[PDB]
Symmetry: D2
Subunit: 448 residues, 4 copies
Amino acid sequence: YRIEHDTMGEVRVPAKALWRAQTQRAVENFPISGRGLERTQIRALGLLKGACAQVNSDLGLLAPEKADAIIAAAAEIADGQHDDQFPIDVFQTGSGTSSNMNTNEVIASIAAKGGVTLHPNDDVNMSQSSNDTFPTATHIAATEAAVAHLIPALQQLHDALAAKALDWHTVVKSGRTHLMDAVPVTLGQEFSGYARQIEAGIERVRACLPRLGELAIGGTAVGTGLNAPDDFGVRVVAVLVAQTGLSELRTAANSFEAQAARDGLVEASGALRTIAVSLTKIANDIRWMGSGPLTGLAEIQLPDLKVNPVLPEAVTQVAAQVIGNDAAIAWGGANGAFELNVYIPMMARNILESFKLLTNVSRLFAQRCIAGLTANVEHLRRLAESSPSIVTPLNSAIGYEEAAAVAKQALKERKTIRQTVIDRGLIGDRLSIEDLDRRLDVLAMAKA
Amino acid sequence: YRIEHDTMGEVRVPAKALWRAQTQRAVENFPISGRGLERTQIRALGLLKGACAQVNSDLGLLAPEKADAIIAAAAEIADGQHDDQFPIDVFQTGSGTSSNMNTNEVIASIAAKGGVTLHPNDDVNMSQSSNDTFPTATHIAATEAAVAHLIPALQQLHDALAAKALDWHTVVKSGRTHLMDAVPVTLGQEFSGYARQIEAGIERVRACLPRLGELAIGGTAVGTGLNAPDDFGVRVVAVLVAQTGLSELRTAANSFEAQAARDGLVEASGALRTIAVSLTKIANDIRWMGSGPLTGLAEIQLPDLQKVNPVLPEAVTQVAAQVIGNDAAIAWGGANGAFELNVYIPMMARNILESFKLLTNVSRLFAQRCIAGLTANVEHLRRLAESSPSIVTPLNSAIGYEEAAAVAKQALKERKTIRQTVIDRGLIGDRLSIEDLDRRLDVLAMAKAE
Amino acid sequence: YRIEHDTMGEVRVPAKALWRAQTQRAVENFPISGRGLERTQIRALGLLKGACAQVNSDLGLLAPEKADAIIAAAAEIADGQHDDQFPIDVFQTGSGTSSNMNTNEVIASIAAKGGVTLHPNDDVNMSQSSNDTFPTATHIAATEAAVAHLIPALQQLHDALAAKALDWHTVVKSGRTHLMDAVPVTLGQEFSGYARQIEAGIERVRACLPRLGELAIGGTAVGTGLNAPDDFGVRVVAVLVAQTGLSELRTAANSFEAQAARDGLVEASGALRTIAVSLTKIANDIRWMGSGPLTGLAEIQLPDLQPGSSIMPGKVNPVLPEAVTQVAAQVIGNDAAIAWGGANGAFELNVYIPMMARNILESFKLLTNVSRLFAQRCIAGLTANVEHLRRLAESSPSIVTPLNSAIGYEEAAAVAKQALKERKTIRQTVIDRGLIGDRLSIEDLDRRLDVLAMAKAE
Amino acid sequence: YRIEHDTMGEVRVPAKALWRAQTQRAVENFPISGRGLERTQIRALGLLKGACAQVNSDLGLLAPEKADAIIAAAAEIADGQHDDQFPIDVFQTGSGTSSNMNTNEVIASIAAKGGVTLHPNDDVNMSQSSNDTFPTATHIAATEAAVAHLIPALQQLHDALAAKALDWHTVVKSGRTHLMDAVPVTLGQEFSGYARQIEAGIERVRACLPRLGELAIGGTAVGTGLNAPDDFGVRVVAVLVAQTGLSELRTAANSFEAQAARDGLVEASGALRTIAVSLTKIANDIRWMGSGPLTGLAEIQLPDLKVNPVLPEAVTQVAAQVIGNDAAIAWGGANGAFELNVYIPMMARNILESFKLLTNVSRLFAQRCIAGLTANVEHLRRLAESSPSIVTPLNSAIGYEEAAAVAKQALKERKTIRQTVIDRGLIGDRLSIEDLDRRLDVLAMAKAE
Ligand SMILES: COc1ccc(S(=O)(=O)N2CCCCCC2)cc1NC(=O)Cc1c[nH]c2ccccc12
Ligand SMILES: COc1ccc(S(=O)(=O)N2CCCCCC2)cc1NC(=O)Cc1c[nH]c2ccccc12
Ligand SMILES: [Mg+2]
Ligand SMILES: [Mg+2]
């Protein structure tokens, strides 16, 4: 319940708060959503401040005592020990300068407890600006989310789908095209398609990493690097790669592009949106397969968490949210001006949420839905034995001409191929029942 | 770390948690976003459960001691006293059944402390289903957000813009079309346009209320009202209207449409998306008019909150982007219902209620901390209007279009007013008095302000 | 071919072209999409220029021989006699000034063929600017599309759905929630829900018309009305309303808002987007209820419209629901383009008008045309599989609840279990377990298990 | 009119039309948009039908005489001689059945003129389904649009922006952050950023090609390849690669994924949407740069076509359309069921249009706007030299208070910072002219040479 001195008046700050005047001013300025930065974003801001202090100490610009204090305070933030010291709304100044200052002030307060005096700006923000810090922290968080969390969760889901594709390789059923009875497929073939969609999803995330991992650090206020060392960015990136193990982090190809635009986030969101499109198809098919029992398709049983398909519902709802977040990201991305895109906090919220939702729902879908599915094998065969058949596999036995006459008579009389063959008296020396039954076998027709 | 026994086994629940086994199972099944219901949707579930108990009591279906205990517990929820007792993810079963059961369990636990035993399902969920309750609460929350919070916030912003329009009635400046110099307007006219965009926004929200306020309560599992009293819906709506004063709440025109679809939320989101479009135009223009102080337009100065950065225009345009994205998520969920139930309700509810909250809060902040304190560079704006090639056209009938083009070119080159340029080129004569020049170049008259 | 001279130089123009040099420059400047204005937009530009000439004549600003020639030329354009004379890309200068000049030039060329010389700017564009004309024509076209075409098409679909709701009033079936078996409904109730969605869609279009019908005409370059008569807008609107019968057309409430923004198009697109969301639900349910007919739900049969497959000769597909869902997808995309253009005005003018007009008019057209085809070629001819639906309802575990008060919920659960195992009706299963006697007569069971009464049909 | 027949019976067809019964049913079933397939789509269908006939001939399944007649007619269709014989609406059955039958019927009618009888389904559709042919034609058209048309157009725009970046390397000006005056940049640096966005655009398009170029051909009705040779897909793709030179065309990794989903079109549309986002930033900045000539920024002059920024307006309208199309594509993409995604004609319309608009507008922007921009060089430098943003490097010599007084007086009097420092009498005590000129060198402050 203490008081502080801002160069435009007095500021009242909570007693257990490590933030100071500028942060409390942002709290008062932006009461919009009531939600602040996520743990991933706070962690990335701590990682960045420790790396910058390390490079400023290495170049002789910051006294080793001060640098050690920033590095220890930053490590605490990166390890999640201060997730309650970042109270600023997401809907803040569009550079994220408010959250940048919040990080500077918390490090200064942590350092003061350990007996060292740090200036938030002059020491913790040395060689940095209001504008190259928050987008760097955003891209660190997004790249960690892609590489450490999302890709492994998608691989878990891919592996679960692929395991079912192999278990069910010969579980024959009816194909459905336009929702109408089609020629046979196997449940395994369908699951091989779902698994490819997720494998292609991982390919799509991997393809965006060369641009998602681009960091602005070192470009300072406008991209020129004025008031930073010439190699600040390259040096800070190498410390971040060393401390995170994220080899995908890199300096920006062009320091102006990296601050004027957030195109890498727009690109990454498009991969997530494609994954959401794939997941929607997979989840919808699985809840339709599970439907009924009496009124639906009743092809598979879902694990109970008459079972409602609650994890397909959570997946399709997450996909809707990723599609909406993706529209917000593109809207912010397009609306930069000159040297700075000022939609960074909103874009950060949306892409980091999309990563988190897809990671968590993919691992739940894989573990608590896909792994436990059971096929209703005899029902699925009954459906395959009700699919349309074709005459092609009789060509070698009755010839192109009789086969075409079977096809025409089956269509006119609304009969099966098999029954039309029997009815036309074709069972004989050229075609036993056995030969008819082997040629028209529904698992053979699936070409598994 | 207290321990409970379920139909499937044993679950540990936090000691000070008022939720029970079903909520704890939902917490375990849906660790997806780490974000649960918002205050408005918890309040509405409290309002709904209180009105349902009142009606079940009035119809002689529920013992009055139990009904009174539910009503007192539901009032505490509606008053925001238990916002920490709703831990289930937004990304839950798509009917919102898990959150419905969370409400039933919390009410039973609150009642237990006052010495009254309630069964969550048989008593707190009496006459209700797993499918007509959550969407009712969603539409109560959205209707209240629209009528009680957003419309008044938009009226505050309208009135701030209109006050600026009146203050700046005679503040003449260059028009701009295609970003290029155009004939004169006043800042007041421009702000009159902004005010109309916000007044039309209020009309758009008002226009959606006949369908936003439709409640599914009484339709039970599929819309038929099986296992509810025949008049349960109209009775519960009447209690909600009597208690809340929200006369916009109404039974649904068609019980099936009210559960198979959430088209009222899609409709309302379109009104919020239009307001977000309007606010983007208003906020962009204001930050461009404040740009500078040297190399920008330097028309106005914004009040300093954090050379002032336009931080509230940035908040407004970021909120608008969020509303656009939320609007896309809502329409996606809305389209994808099947047969008797749309199972995207928790996601739709999160997005629609957030959109209401962000637009309400940012509209008030923009009105009070940006619009009200803008200051115009009045003399500078008039000098630029008076120096613009766009104003030479009214000279054509005195000096011809080719001499008027030469006046325009020299005025720009020498950074002079059109008036001073006409005098410097020796055009004052019998063909054009000083008085006729000042009439022809009266830029405030060119703006045609009331 | 035939030469001309623009203040920039000599321009070659096709011989049968009624456009002139400014239009030919715009053709050369914007080869982007290869698509120009639609018939509805051309018609509205013709309506507008005819009304402007009438007013300019009435106010003594334009000589009558000149006004009469513009009126006669503008009526030919509004009648669709010149839909090949508007070659400019949609993706043009964002005020639509290129298309406005195209209209002025085509009118001057028509008037020339009758011996009257019209200056495209000074006569055909009198009292107008490059910025209040194209948005006015856009709003006229959109209002016409809403009132004369879309609402009657939606009413036709509403009536077709409501006729099925009545015909199927007693067609009992199992509900589905989460795609899982639920308590009984009727096919008529479900179709009553679809009908309400369309009726609500008409209410949504009607609710947007007070602002969709607002016209910018009279505001000139920046909204101030400089260089027009003070009452030009109300006079032009009066003529348009009298000639067209479009009672929704009105002068804008605020002349700056009507040129700085196109918020009425964004608003109207939201209504269309909501209709696309409703149609998606209706069409999806209908193709699911038609699915199979051996491996799907087989609740209804859709009318056959064309062969489905060479490989599977008997197979017929739900082509109209596919056309409806694809249209809905296009409306939702168009809606995103409209809102993007709407947000990005600057100062006195929104310069996304041609792109917003393309998208809003296409959404109107696709929804009008598909709604009529869906009603006529799909809904009107649906047939229900009444006995299949009733069999499933009478076999459903969901219908045992009404037995609770006679045999208890535990015995009712055992009846459900056994019926679902032995593929029997609930009625038969109650008999097969000897529960008919003291507390439960055979007519009492038939009263409790009346599936149509459980649907609670009005 | 004449009488034609299909499995559903007899149909009246315009006497002279080359289509037959199924096309005419589709003309009556789908009068929705009044727009049919584009030139690119008709070309891809003609290419595919010729390639299928070559492979059927090579495998001895189709008589050489019939394969020759199909190949010749498919070449006339591909070359654009019969576009007026493709009347079917975009909004047709969602597999593109109707447009597949349109191609088969028109090939049969052309072959009949030359005295060869072809059955549209038994000969022209041999070893094929709609479900594999229409998505294959769509992916051929999209891959050709990406490689042959869009990437070269974007390279042209990249090169025009990079040429400006070089030409304007020393054209110092005010930076702008939040629309507010900031420390100096050069126009060249800004254009280098715009060039990077377009180069990255090209990288995004190239990164999607391993999946965009996947073709369904050979999977037939459901993905199983029933009723086709086991190697039909690999043979047909090899013929298409030889004929088109598009090495990016490839057999699908998984035949079921290639028919049950159109995820590669969704992926590709995301690249195009990101390009639209980049082009919006570039075009907005350029029209603001050109604003005025009195009351705006007046940094540059755009070439005339007082000039309105008409190609920036075309570029930002195109971008809005690509964002809309992108939403329609993702909506179709998500809504497949079981063995088939039935949104293909709508998804095809949208992505092919996005390719075309970006290609055409990128070339126009490059040639008729970027190439001809002129910079107000002296004006830009004067404002940079007059900005309060450049007073900071004086703080250590004159103190914060006097640096603030210098900035305030320079703004009020409309003078440079250098002239204001001299006017306030600060030379001698605090610093020398040599030190002043080092500290206020705006080109050096932009970290350019
Ligand atoms: C953001 O545009 C401006 C910002 C500041 C100033 S200022 O007042 O501070 N100052 C003018 C007085 C003398 C000192 C230099 C700058 C002017 C400008 N515009 C202009 O000069 C506009 C202009 C008029 N004739 C021109 C011819 C060529 C290019 C531009 C123009
Ligand atoms: C678009 O901004 C401009 C456009 C043109 C011109 S101009 O050169 O044609 N011209 C300059 C001489 C007299 C002023 C009017 C005419 C200047 C400007 N900006 C400014 O004066 C900037 C400015 C510096 N001190 C100020 C103090 C208050 C307000 C604005 C400013
Ligand atoms: Mg690595
Ligand atoms: Mg069945």
